Amino acid sequence: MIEFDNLTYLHGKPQGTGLLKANPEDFVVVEDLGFEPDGEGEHILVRILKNGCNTRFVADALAKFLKIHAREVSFAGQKDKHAVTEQWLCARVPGKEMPDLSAFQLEGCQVLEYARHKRKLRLGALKGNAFTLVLREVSNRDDVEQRLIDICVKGVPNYFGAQRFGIGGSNLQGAQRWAQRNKRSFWLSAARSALFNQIVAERLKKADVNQVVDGDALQLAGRGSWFVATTEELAELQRRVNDKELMITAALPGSGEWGTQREALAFEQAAVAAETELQALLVREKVEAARRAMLLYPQQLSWNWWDDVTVEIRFWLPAGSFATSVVRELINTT
């Protein structure tokens, strides 16, 4: 298996270093539901700024303040103390009164806004996240500037970041050992994600990383739907890919059809051909194969150098894409 650090670079490996997330204020994430609260219904959505604790800790304290059971507070995913997050929480409190959520106090947290909403927030349901990060001790400004320019144009690889593989690589290691419930889920997720990263690393070795081939699975920008390239539509499909209307995808292997056909499917199979044990694990466990865009086009990418060795970068990414995957193409952090 290709190691994370050896994953192919779109812009080539950076010619300089810096510091990411040196303090929580250098890494600010604003969650994006994709909608405004209904303004009615049995749930209270509450946007809380948090700095210095995890998502479960705040949700426990919100439960207690509302005098409801802990299970009645839900969110998108659990986020540690190492970044600043404006995170959405969701409390079931029947009726049509509004509790004074502005009087809820907890160290390092701020209640920002709240409103009723009809449906529960569930794990993984965000549209995306808007990031504000400060990269410090940047060794090569000229290199980072050019890379930012080139990212506007070409994007970055849409890799799963190191976080997906658990601390120390443990989730992938666990997958590899098992291929010979919370843990089960993390292991399967690591396995399929590692395979996706590998197929992208291989595809990036082609002369033209955005060349559409016959059988490719092309996804519409900004949603899940995808369809299969054919030879007679290729010049037209190529144009749409070049114009960032369509996204060439790579497999998340699993049971059923991976979704590519003909030459593209042969390529995806060959790219992970030695990984028969992880493939069989996923099939056995009925983890349906899926598609994921190969590239990532950070939205509203903006930046500002405060001096020759400090830059503040902003962008928005869809749910399931990583800020570290953008930063991997700017600076070396190992």
Coordinates of C-alpha atoms in Angstrom, one line a residue:
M1 CA 0.0 0.0 0.0
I2 CA 1.2 3.5 -0.8
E3 CA 2.0 5.3 2.5
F4 CA 0.3 8.5 3.3
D5 CA 3.5 10.6 3.0
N6 CA 4.3 9.0 -0.4
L7 CA 0.8 9.8 -1.9
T8 CA 1.4 11.6 -5.2
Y9 CA 1.3 15.5 -5.2
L10 CA -0.5 17.4 -7.9
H11 CA 1.8 20.4 -7.7
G12 CA 4.7 18.3 -6.6
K13 CA 6.0 18.2 -3.0
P14 CA 6.4 21.6 -1.5
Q15 CA 9.8 23.4 -1.4
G16 CA 9.3 24.8 2.1
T17 CA 7.8 24.2 5.5
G18 CA 5.5 25.8 8.1
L19 CA 3.2 25.2 11.2
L20 CA -0.4 24.2 10.9
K21 CA -2.7 24.4 14.0
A22 CA 0.0 25.6 16.3
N23 CA -2.8 26.9 18.5
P24 CA -6.6 26.4 18.3
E25 CA -7.2 30.1 17.1
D26 CA -5.0 29.3 14.0
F27 CA -7.6 26.8 12.8
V28 CA -11.2 28.1 12.8
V29 CA -14.0 26.0 11.3
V30 CA -17.5 27.4 10.8
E31 CA -20.0 24.5 10.1
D32 CA -22.5 24.8 7.2
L33 CA -25.8 23.0 7.4
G34 CA -26.7 24.0 3.9
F35 CA -30.0 25.5 5.0
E36 CA -31.3 28.0 7.6
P37 CA -33.3 26.7 10.5
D38 CA -37.1 26.2 9.8
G39 CA -38.0 28.5 12.7
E40 CA -40.5 25.9 13.9
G41 CA -40.5 22.2 15.1
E42 CA -39.6 20.1 18.1
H43 CA -35.8 20.7 17.8
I44 CA -33.7 23.6 18.8
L45 CA -30.6 24.1 16.6
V46 CA -27.9 26.0 18.6
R47 CA -24.6 27.3 17.1
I48 CA -21.9 27.2 19.7
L49 CA -18.4 28.5 19.3
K50 CA -16.1 26.2 21.1
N51 CA -12.4 26.5 22.0
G52 CA -10.8 24.0 24.3
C53 CA -13.2 21.1 24.6
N54 CA -14.7 18.3 22.5
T55 CA -18.2 18.0 20.9
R56 CA -19.5 15.4 23.4
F57 CA -18.5 17.5 26.4
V58 CA -20.5 20.5 25.2
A59 CA -23.5 18.3 24.2
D60 CA -23.5 16.7 27.7
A61 CA -23.5 20.2 29.3
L62 CA -26.3 21.4 26.9
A63 CA -28.4 18.3 27.9
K64 CA -27.9 19.1 31.6
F65 CA -28.8 22.8 31.1
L66 CA -32.0 21.9 29.3
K67 CA -32.8 19.1 31.9
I68 CA -33.1 16.6 29.1
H69 CA -31.4 13.2 28.7
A70 CA -27.9 13.2 26.9
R71 CA -29.2 11.2 23.9
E72 CA -31.6 14.0 23.0
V73 CA -28.7 16.2 21.9
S74 CA -27.3 15.5 18.5
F75 CA -24.6 16.9 16.0
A76 CA -22.7 16.2 12.8
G77 CA -19.5 14.6 14.3
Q78 CA -17.3 14.8 17.3
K79 CA -14.5 17.5 17.2
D80 CA -11.6 17.7 19.6
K81 CA -10.2 20.5 21.5
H82 CA -7.4 21.3 19.0
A83 CA -9.3 23.7 16.6
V84 CA -11.8 26.4 17.1
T85 CA -15.2 25.2 15.8
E86 CA -18.6 27.1 15.4
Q87 CA -20.5 23.8 15.7
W88 CA -24.2 23.2 15.3
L89 CA -25.9 21.2 18.1
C90 CA -29.6 20.0 18.1
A91 CA -31.8 19.5 21.2
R92 CA -35.2 17.9 21.2
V93 CA -37.5 20.0 23.4
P94 CA -41.2 19.6 22.6
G95 CA -43.6 22.5 22.2
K96 CA -43.3 26.0 21.0
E97 CA -41.5 27.8 23.8
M98 CA -37.9 28.9 23.5
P99 CA -35.5 28.3 26.3
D100 CA -33.1 31.2 27.0
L101 CA -30.0 29.5 25.4
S102 CA -28.2 32.9 25.7
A103 CA -28.0 32.2 29.5
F104 CA -26.1 28.8 28.9
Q105 CA -22.5 29.2 30.1
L106 CA -19.6 26.8 29.8
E107 CA -15.9 27.5 29.8
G108 CA -14.4 28.3 26.5
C109 CA -17.8 28.3 24.7
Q110 CA -20.1 31.0 23.3
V111 CA -23.7 30.6 22.2
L112 CA -24.0 32.3 18.8
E113 CA -27.5 31.8 17.5
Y114 CA -30.4 29.4 17.9
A115 CA -33.8 28.6 16.3
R116 CA -36.3 25.8 16.1
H117 CA -36.1 23.2 13.4
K118 CA -38.3 20.3 12.4
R119 CA -35.8 17.5 11.8
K120 CA -33.0 16.1 13.9
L121 CA -29.3 16.8 13.0
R122 CA -27.6 13.5 12.3
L123 CA -23.9 12.4 12.0
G124 CA -22.4 13.4 8.7
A125 CA -25.2 15.6 7.5
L126 CA -23.3 19.0 7.0
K127 CA -23.1 20.6 3.6
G128 CA -19.5 21.6 4.4
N129 CA -17.2 23.9 6.4
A130 CA -15.7 27.3 6.0
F131 CA -12.0 27.4 7.3
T132 CA -9.8 30.2 8.5
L133 CA -6.2 29.1 9.1
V134 CA -3.0 30.8 9.9
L135 CA 0.2 29.1 8.7
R136 CA 3.2 30.1 10.8
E137 CA 7.0 30.1 10.3
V138 CA 6.5 29.8 6.5
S139 CA 10.1 29.1 5.2
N140 CA 9.3 29.8 1.5
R141 CA 6.7 32.5 0.9
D142 CA 7.4 32.6 -2.9
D143 CA 6.6 28.9 -3.1
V144 CA 3.4 29.1 -1.1
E145 CA 2.1 32.1 -3.1
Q146 CA 2.7 30.2 -6.4
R147 CA 1.0 27.1 -5.0
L148 CA -2.1 29.1 -3.9
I149 CA -2.3 30.6 -7.4
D150 CA -2.0 27.1 -9.0
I151 CA -4.6 25.7 -6.6
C152 CA -7.2 28.3 -7.7
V153 CA -6.6 26.8 -11.2
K154 CA -6.0 23.1 -10.8
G155 CA -7.3 22.3 -7.2
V156 CA -5.7 19.7 -5.0
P157 CA -6.1 15.9 -4.7
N158 CA -9.2 15.1 -2.6
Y159 CA -7.3 12.8 -0.3
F160 CA -8.6 11.5 3.0
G161 CA -6.4 13.3 5.6
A162 CA -4.2 11.5 8.2
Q163 CA -7.0 11.9 10.7
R164 CA -9.2 9.3 8.8
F165 CA -6.7 6.6 9.7
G166 CA -6.9 7.0 13.5
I167 CA -4.2 8.0 15.9
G168 CA -0.8 6.5 14.9
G169 CA -2.4 4.9 11.9
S170 CA -4.3 2.5 14.3
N171 CA -7.6 2.3 12.3
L172 CA -5.9 1.2 9.1
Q173 CA -3.6 -1.2 11.1
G174 CA -6.8 -2.6 12.7
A175 CA -8.4 -3.0 9.3
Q176 CA -5.3 -4.9 8.0
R177 CA -5.1 -7.2 10.9
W178 CA -8.9 -8.0 10.8
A179 CA -8.8 -8.7 7.0
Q180 CA -6.6 -11.6 8.0
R181 CA -19.1 -1.7 16.5
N182 CA -17.7 1.8 16.8
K183 CA -14.3 0.2 16.1
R184 CA -15.8 -1.9 13.2
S185 CA -17.0 1.3 11.6
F186 CA -13.6 3.1 12.0
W187 CA -11.8 0.1 10.5
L188 CA -14.0 -0.3 7.5
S189 CA -13.8 3.5 6.9
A190 CA -10.0 3.5 7.1
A191 CA -9.8 0.5 4.7
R192 CA -11.9 2.0 1.9
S193 CA -10.4 5.4 2.4
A194 CA -6.9 4.1 2.1
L195 CA -7.8 2.3 -1.1
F196 CA -9.4 5.5 -2.6
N197 CA -6.2 7.5 -1.7
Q198 CA -4.1 4.9 -3.6
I199 CA -6.3 5.0 -6.7
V200 CA -6.0 8.8 -6.8
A201 CA -2.2 8.6 -6.2
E202 CA -2.0 6.3 -9.2
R203 CA -4.3 8.4 -11.5
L204 CA -2.1 11.4 -10.7
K205 CA 0.8 9.6 -12.4
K206 CA -0.9 9.9 -15.8
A207 CA 0.3 12.6 -18.3
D208 CA -3.0 14.5 -18.1
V209 CA -4.6 14.0 -14.7
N210 CA -7.9 15.4 -16.0
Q211 CA -8.1 13.2 -19.1
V212 CA -11.6 11.5 -19.2
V213 CA -11.4 7.9 -20.4
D214 CA -14.1 5.6 -21.5
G215 CA -16.0 4.1 -18.6
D216 CA -15.1 6.9 -16.1
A217 CA -17.7 7.8 -13.5
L218 CA -18.3 11.5 -13.7
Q219 CA -20.0 13.3 -10.9
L220 CA -22.0 16.6 -11.1
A221 CA -20.3 19.4 -9.2
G222 CA -21.9 20.0 -5.8
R223 CA -23.9 16.8 -5.6
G224 CA -23.8 13.0 -5.5
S225 CA -25.1 12.0 -8.9
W226 CA -22.7 10.6 -11.5
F227 CA -22.9 8.9 -14.8
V228 CA -20.6 6.9 -17.1
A229 CA -18.4 8.4 -19.8
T230 CA -18.7 6.8 -23.3
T231 CA -16.4 7.1 -26.3
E232 CA -18.8 9.2 -28.5
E233 CA -19.5 11.8 -25.8
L234 CA -15.7 12.2 -24.8
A235 CA -14.8 15.6 -26.3
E236 CA -18.0 17.0 -24.8
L237 CA -17.4 15.4 -21.4
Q238 CA -13.8 16.5 -21.4
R239 CA -14.9 20.1 -21.9
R240 CA -17.3 19.8 -18.9
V241 CA -14.5 18.4 -16.8
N242 CA -12.1 21.1 -17.8
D243 CA -14.8 23.7 -17.0
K244 CA -15.2 22.1 -13.5
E245 CA -18.9 21.1 -14.2
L246 CA -18.1 17.4 -13.9
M247 CA -15.6 15.8 -11.4
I248 CA -13.7 12.6 -12.5
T249 CA -14.1 10.2 -9.6
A250 CA -12.2 7.4 -7.9
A251 CA -13.6 4.3 -6.3
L252 CA -14.3 3.7 -2.7
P253 CA -14.1 -0.1 -3.1
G254 CA -16.7 -2.4 -1.5
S255 CA -19.6 -4.8 -2.4
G256 CA -21.5 -4.4 -5.7
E257 CA -20.2 -2.6 -8.8
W258 CA -17.5 0.1 -8.3
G259 CA -19.3 2.1 -11.0
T260 CA -16.6 2.6 -13.6
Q261 CA -16.7 0.4 -16.6
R262 CA -14.3 -0.8 -19.3
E263 CA -10.9 1.0 -19.4
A264 CA -11.5 3.1 -16.3
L265 CA -12.6 0.1 -14.2
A266 CA -9.6 -1.9 -15.4
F267 CA -7.3 1.0 -14.3
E268 CA -9.0 1.2 -10.8
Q269 CA -8.7 -2.5 -10.3
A270 CA -5.0 -2.6 -11.3
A271 CA -4.3 0.4 -9.0
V272 CA -5.3 -1.6 -5.8
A273 CA -4.7 -5.1 -7.2
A274 CA -2.3 -6.2 -4.5
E275 CA -4.8 -5.3 -1.8
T276 CA -7.0 -8.3 -2.1
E277 CA -7.4 -8.8 1.7
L278 CA -8.8 -5.3 2.3
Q279 CA -11.1 -5.6 -0.8
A280 CA -12.5 -8.9 0.5
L281 CA -13.1 -7.6 4.0
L282 CA -15.2 -4.7 2.6
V283 CA -17.2 -7.0 0.3
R284 CA -17.8 -9.5 3.1
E285 CA -19.0 -6.8 5.5
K286 CA -21.4 -5.5 2.8
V287 CA -19.9 -2.0 2.6
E288 CA -21.4 -0.8 -0.7
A289 CA -18.9 0.6 -3.2
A290 CA -19.2 4.3 -3.9
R291 CA -17.7 7.2 -5.9
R292 CA -15.7 10.2 -4.6
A293 CA -14.3 13.1 -6.6
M294 CA -10.6 12.8 -7.3
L295 CA -9.9 16.5 -7.1
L296 CA -11.0 19.2 -4.6
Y297 CA -11.7 22.8 -5.7
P298 CA -11.6 24.9 -2.5
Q299 CA -14.4 27.5 -2.7
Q300 CA -13.9 31.2 -2.1
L301 CA -10.2 30.7 -1.7
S302 CA -8.6 33.9 -0.3
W303 CA -5.5 34.7 1.5
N304 CA -3.6 37.3 3.2
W305 CA 0.2 37.5 4.1
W306 CA 0.6 39.4 7.5
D307 CA 4.4 39.3 7.0
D308 CA 7.0 37.3 5.0
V309 CA 6.5 34.3 7.3
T310 CA 2.8 34.4 8.3
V311 CA -0.3 33.8 6.0
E312 CA -4.0 33.6 6.8
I313 CA -5.9 31.4 4.3
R314 CA -9.7 31.1 3.9
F315 CA -11.8 28.6 1.9
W316 CA -14.9 26.5 2.1
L317 CA -14.9 22.7 1.4
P318 CA -17.7 20.2 1.1
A319 CA -18.4 17.7 3.8
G320 CA -15.9 14.9 3.8
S321 CA -13.0 16.9 2.4
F322 CA -10.1 17.9 4.6
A323 CA -8.3 21.2 5.1
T324 CA -5.1 19.2 5.6
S325 CA -5.5 18.0 2.1
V326 CA -5.3 21.7 0.9
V327 CA -2.4 22.4 3.2
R328 CA -0.4 19.3 2.1
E329 CA 0.1 21.0 -1.3
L330 CA 1.3 24.3 0.3
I331 CA 3.8 23.4 3.0
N332 CA 5.7 20.4 4.4
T333 CA 4.6 19.7 8.1
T334 CA 5.2 15.9 8.3

